[PDB]
């Protein structure tokens, strides 16, 4: 069955805020563990540590976020999982100082997230797959 559209929106925007914080200048790598687990957590966690190691950071402007589809699979006492398909329109700037100019992008892309509810009532993003447009 379908998940509430605003609840998927709030999950994806907390993820996007945490991504901005972890990849940002303050380098809140710990905060990734609030929203991510498993392979997605490992990937973004190594990206955050690499960025902080090379003294680069990221600035974001999230122009549009829209939940295209959202489903929840309450698989009994084994836990629950969910799948969210969202279209992101976002601009970003990598502040690196070993180059004369900072690299920027503006991208509209679809992304599917697979999340799993932990046994504490909280949701955590576990896997993701982009299709860029």
């Amino acid at each position: 069955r379908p998940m509430d559209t605003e609840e998927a929106e709030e999950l994806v925007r907390q993820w996007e805020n945490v991504k901005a914080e972890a990849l940002g200048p303050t380098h809140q790598v710990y905060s990734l563990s609030e929203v991510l687990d498993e392979s997605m957590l490992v990937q973004w966690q190594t990206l955050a540590q690499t960025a902080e190691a090379k003294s680069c950071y990221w600035r974001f402007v999230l122009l549009h976020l829209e939940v295209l589809q959202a489903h929840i699979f309450e698989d009994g006492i084994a836990g629950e999982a969910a799948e969210i398909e969202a279209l992101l329109e976002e601009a970003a700037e990598l502040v690196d100082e070993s180059q004369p100019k900072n690299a920027k992008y503006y991208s509209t892309y679809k992304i599917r997230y697979i999340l799993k509810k932990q046994e504490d009532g909280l949701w955590k993003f576990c896997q993701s797959d982009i299709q860029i447009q």
Partner: peptide, 9 residues
């Protein structure tokens, strides 16, 4: 090295 597009997701 790092590329700016690594932060989409």
């Amino acid at each position: 090295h790092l590329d700016v597009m690594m932060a989409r997701g």
